A paper describes a structure:
Lastly, we determined a 2.53-Å crystal structure of recombinant RBD in complex with Fab J08 to address details in the antibody–antigen interface. When not under the constraints of an intact protomer or trimer, the BSA between J08 and RBD based on the X-ray structure is 676 Å2, which is most similar to conformation. In the X-ray structure of RBD-Fab J08, R56 is predicted to simultaneously form a salt bridge and hydrogen bond with the side chains of E484 and Q493, respectively. Based on the X-ray structure, N58M might also stabilize the local environment as it is part of a hydrophobic cluster that includes F486 (RBD), W47 (heavy chain [HC]), and L96 (light chain [LC]). CDRH3, on the other hand, is predicted to form backbone hydrogen bonds with the side chains of RBD residues N487 and Y489, further strengthening the interaction of J08 to its relatively small epitope. In the up conformation 3, the antibody is tilted slightly, increasing the number of CDRH3 contacts, consistent with the X-ray structure of the RBD-Fab J08 complex. Accordingly, in conformations 1 and 3 and the X-ray structure, the heavy chain interface residues (defined as contributing greater than 5 Å2 BSA) all reside in CDRH2 and CDRH3. In decreasing order, the RBD-antibody/receptor BSA is largest for S2K146 (980 Å2), CV07-250 (943 Å2), ACE2 (843 Å2), S2E12 (753 Å2), J08 (675 Å2, based on the RBD-Fab J08 X-ray structure), and A23-58.1 (603 Å2). Our models of J08 in complex with the SARS-CoV-2 6P D614G (Wuhan) strain S-protein/RBD suggest an interdependence between E484 and Q493 of RBD with J08 CDRH2 R56, and we infer that a mutation of the 484 and 493 sites in Omicron is the primary factor leading to decreased sensitivity of J08 against this variant.
Numbering used by the authors:
A (entry chain L): 1 to 91, 96 to 211
B (entry chain A): 336 to 518, 521 to 527
C (entry chain H): 2 to 52, 52A, 53 to 82, 82A, 82B, 82C, 83 to 100, 100A, ...
The structure:
């Protein structure tokens, strides 16, 4: 099978700038190439077909070029709706995909922590949630510490998509323990590391 | 002349690999053919079936294959179609006879008789009395096939899905094409 | 020119799934049907394509021996069958069509129409409604801005929808993508940042809906005291 390599993996640009997306093939696909756009929660939408032909209804700012093994998708001037994932497609395989996100000033996360509710404690389970709100860039590290003991295997993270208003990200980390194991300790801390923070910030509570 | 070996044969060939029997040094009694009520097609070109039993020819050819009902019309001079262009082509000056009959009771199987094939893809049309038994993958697109079936890369032969409940146009028909050479005569009528 | 697929399915590991794709009349004469899947948070993966007019089908290398694609010209419906399902087969399966010339049998490489998608979840877990717990606002959740939310925990299968104040509260709301815990059940959180002055004057209620289990739960998140 011909492997389709899409470069780069992520592009951070601003509205009004030109975006150039590359799709390379291990063997010649002639002109049998298509470019697709996919927004969150939607099915892929065709933009360019046969390497260079624009699809019906697609704005003229989308342009495709290339032949054989080297191809390029070009957005002349980025509109705010053009920030999504873009795939190149050969007759048999799709590309890995390229994410186009909005470049923004570095923003530190607002760190919040939530002790478990009494209703969940009655169920026999305790869940502690650490909230990282409105930060950029997306890369952030969250460390769970219970009585100054680093926790591993009982936490899970999740990151929202880039906000359509402030172009930031939000992260939610949930540390889940049993009600018995939750009462064997007192201090529950959440340590956050990010570019906007000069030093790692810790949000903690005593049970 | 061994007419029965062609008409009354147990197995018949596909169109792309049509068989041919050269008949010579014998006396041919065509009355056994034009007095039979078993043929659905009996069109002779450039010759009279009744006067056939009183003529001499240097050699006579008997080609046999299996097509569907609606394709028997293509076995005639000046016809076009997937069979006439890619499988069996008759010359425009054809001097002979074309005979066919329904063979649904023999060549149609419940799950479909996928043994009878016809050529569906070819870059050029066949010359009169030319046979092509190639199995090379046909390149319908811009990418090479490399001998593998795939996107716009097709095996050149397509199977007749001969089922006994198909329509009469889609049912198998056994065809025998008789060609009389007008070139020392070795075959003659009684 | 429409492509309507069958409903979402939950299949046990080792079982087989058959997803249908009904097409508009006449599609099977000038179009071919392909099947493309997309795992949660991953890319598109082409599996195979069927040509109805030639009774020909081709499959990808990764899916040969496990996928059987069929087309029923009587009902204008295409089918896909995955044999030995397991966790990485959990994905949204799409049916997509490509144009083909009825006389030359030349197929196009691009897809001109996609289906709505069919979510197939491969897991031994059973359908369970969610448990909504409050994330109370407090000092650990606060200058003039307070953070509160709801924890949608232990539900199966996906998806769930969360709203605040029956859709009245929209600003500052962050509904995070779900995560698959070790128990095989999903967990979700939906937070909202509100002014601290409204913690005593404004009522905040999160509305959770889990259609796979017919579960509609609303939870009032109230401020905590020392
Ligand atoms: C085929 O067999 C039938 C009966 O066995 C016979 O009447 C007929 O003449 C035969 N065909 C030929 C061409 O001899």
């Amino acid at each position: 099978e011909i492997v389709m390599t899409q470069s780069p993996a992520t592009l951070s640009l601003s509205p009004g700038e030109r975006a150039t997306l590359s799709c390379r093939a291990s063997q010649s696909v002639s002109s049998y190439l298509a470019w697709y756009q996919q927004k969150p929660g939607q099915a892929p939408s065709l933009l360019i077909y046969d390497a260079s032909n624009r699809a019906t209804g697609i704005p003229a700012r989308f342009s495709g070029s290339g032949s054989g093994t080297d191809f390029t998708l070009t957005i002349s001037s980025l509109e705010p709706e053009d920030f999504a994932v873009y795939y190149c497609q050969q007759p048999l395989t799709f590309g890995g995909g390229t994410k186009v996100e909005i470049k923004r000033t570095v923003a530190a996360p607002s760190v919040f922590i939530f002790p478990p509710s009494d209703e969940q404690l009655k169920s026999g389970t305790a869940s502690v949630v650490c909230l990282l709100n409105n930060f950029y860039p997306r890369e952030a590290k969250v460390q769970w510490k219970v009585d100054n003991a680093l926790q591993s295997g009982n936490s899970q993270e999740s990151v929202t998509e880039q906000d359509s208003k402030d172009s930031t990200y939000s992260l939610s980390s949930t540390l889940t323990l049993s009600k018995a194991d939750y009462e064997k300790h007192k201090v529950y801390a959440c340590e956050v590391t990010h570019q906007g923070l000069s030093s790692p910030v810790t949000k903690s509570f005593n049970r | 002349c061994p007419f029965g070996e062609v008409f009354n044969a147990t197995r018949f060939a596909s169109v792309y690999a049509w068989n041919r029997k050269r008949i010579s040094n014998c006396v041919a009694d065509y009355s056994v053919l034009y007095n039979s009520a078993s043929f659905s097609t009996f069109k002779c070109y450039g010759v009279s079936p009744t006067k056939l039993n009183d003529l001499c020819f240097t050699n006579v050819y008997a080609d046999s294959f299996v097509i569907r009902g609606d394709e028997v019309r293509q076995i005639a001079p000046g016809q076009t179609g997937k069979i006439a262009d890619y499988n069996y082509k008759l010359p425009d000056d054809f001097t002979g006879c074309v005979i066919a009959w329904n063979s649904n009771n023999l060549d149609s199987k419940v799950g479909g008789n996928y043994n009878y094939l016809y050529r569906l893809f070819r870059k050029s049309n066949l010359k009169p009395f030319e046979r092509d038994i190639s199995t090379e993958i046909y390149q319908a697109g811009s990418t090479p096939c490399n001998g593998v079936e795939g996107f716009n890369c097709y095996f050149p032969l397509q199977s007749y899905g001969f089922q006994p409940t198909n329509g009469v146009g889609y049912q198998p028909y056994r065809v025998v094409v008789l060609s009389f050479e007008l070139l020392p005569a070795t075959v003659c009528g009684p | 020119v429409q492509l309507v697929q069958s409903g979402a399915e939950v299949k046990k590991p080792g079982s087989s799934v058959k997803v249908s794709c009904k097409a508009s009349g006449g599609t099977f004469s000038s179009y071919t049907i392909s099947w493309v899947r997309q795992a949660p948070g991953q890319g598109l993966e082409w599996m195979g394509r069927i040509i109805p007019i030639l009774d020909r089908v081709m499959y990808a290398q990764k899916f040969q021996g496990r996928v059987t694609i069929t087309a029923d010209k009587s009902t204008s419906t295409a089918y896909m069958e995955l044999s030995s399902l397991r966790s990485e087969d959990t994905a949204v399966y799409y049916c997509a069509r490509r144009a083909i010339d009825s006389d030359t049998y030349v197929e196009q490489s691009h897809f001109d129409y996609w289906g709505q998608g069919t979510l197939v979840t491969v897991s031994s877990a059973s359908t369970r409604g969610p448990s909504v717990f409050p994330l109370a606002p407090s000092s650990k959740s606060t200058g003039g801005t307070a953070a509160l939310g709801c924890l949608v925990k232990d539900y199966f299968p996906e998806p769930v929808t969360v709203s605040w104040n029956s859709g009245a509260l929209t600003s500052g709301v962050h509904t995070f993508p779900a995560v698959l815990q070790s128990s095989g059940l999903y967990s979700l959180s939906s937070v909202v940042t509100v002014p601290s002055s409204s913690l005593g004057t404004q009522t905040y209620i999160c509305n959770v809906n889990h259609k796979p289990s017919n579960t509609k739960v609303d939870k009032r998140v109230e401020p905590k005291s020392c």
